[PDB]
Amino acid sequence: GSPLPVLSWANREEVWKIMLNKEKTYLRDQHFLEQHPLLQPKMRAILLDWLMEVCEVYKLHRETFYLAQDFFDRYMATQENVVKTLLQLIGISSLFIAAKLEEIYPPKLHQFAYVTDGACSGDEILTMELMIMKALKWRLSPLTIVSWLNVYMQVAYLNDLHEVLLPQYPQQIFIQIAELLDLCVLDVDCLEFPYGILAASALYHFSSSELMQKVSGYQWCDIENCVKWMVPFAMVIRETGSSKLKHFRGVADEDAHNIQTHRDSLDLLDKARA
């Protein structure tokens, strides 16, 4: 189904079809680390969590992080046999490509080399960003996990105006659901489920299946397998509580929810294993 209202600028079913048709172009592989036998799934969690903290220090948007995560996962699916010391360069260069794509005033190249504690040169990043974009066939416009949550939050708070392009939803509950998604993305087995399924399953845990289906278009049976897998991650967030909305210097409050945050979520990821 399609949860978008009537769109004045295009056929509502045409815009939704294109968004769904793109998700078939961008492939995921929850077992791409079998192509890299020396790597372990936890190394990916430590890398992505480090990129989250880097994003918060430079106040990069959540969309920028999930672009880097998607660039990292799809690039490793094209490569074979990668060492641990090569992971930091691939991750920081994926964030460099993502920051230049998403931010209005992105950080400079030397700042991306600066946060690596001197382990990645500015020219090492330039070499890596070319290899990443060429290996991905320059397909660098995916619908991230966090971009779907933005769609689901807009339709949930829609009025009779049906103006789907002007944002209007509570920032408080948005960062709470994003907090659940930031934890689940550290686990590699999330790639089994499409990005749109993952976001709808996290919204369901903070609301209901009626609101989920109203704003995502997916029936309960489409997300049941994902909801059951997201079960341990949801309660870990419920046991510790929902985080508060942060204010960031230089970032307007009407955009403060879009800034990537970071907690010590690596401890919370291990509790979701049992």
Partner: protein, 298 residues
Amino acid sequence: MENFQKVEKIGEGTYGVVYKARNKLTGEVVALKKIRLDTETEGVPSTAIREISLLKELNHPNIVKLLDVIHTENKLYLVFEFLHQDLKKFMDASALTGIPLPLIKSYLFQLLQGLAFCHSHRVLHRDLKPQNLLINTEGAIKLADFGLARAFGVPVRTYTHEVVTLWYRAPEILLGCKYYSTAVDIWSLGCIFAEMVTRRALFPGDSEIDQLFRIFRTLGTPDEVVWPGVTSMPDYKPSFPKWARQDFSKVVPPLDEDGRSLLSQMLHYDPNKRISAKAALAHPFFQDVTKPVPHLRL
């Protein structure tokens, strides 16, 4: 990166260094945008990464195609489809005799189709001007230069301010709106539409305030009735002079009744009321060019 022989330099600007190349074996001609990577401290430019990724997913008959992206010798070559002339050079060559009305309608119809394809894919062009509209010798016209383009989300957020070349910049941009989307491209096409009719630019301003006053002098100084919320916009001033809206019989004399109606809806002050590209295709101005499809009531 062989088999291609440079034939003529097309130009150098914000896009980059564009050459006209010709395949020696097949006789095929392309346009080569060359990017010297050794002179780019920040690696591949952000405008280059955006345009490549957007054009690799915007395959349409009215969009200049990106054919290949070759990287060699610290150079990044973008291979484009070649068209022999831009619209501005065509309008200048047609300034004396005028562009025939069936050709203006055919060109605007094709431009709206390419823009509707962009907006349905959630992509703003944000630099629609005659220099970026390319024509071939087979009656077609295509959108070019997506370096200033951006994919917008649903919902959108605050994007880059002061976009679009000044003559084709929508009034909501000039007044400093926080959010914007597809309406800014329609305003540009409305200016290009009238420019094809009158053979001169519609609002040729030399500053932000002069561009806004030229719009006010033709369409009238907007108020809360014609544009709700205009008096609260950041760059709005109560000291704006009060000009009366001019009769479109004088603004675009050659345009008939259906033409003035479509142009008015493309130049509506309110971005929420401004006609969309898809709806403009269904306007009675193109009722002789296109025929409607049956609509499933389900």
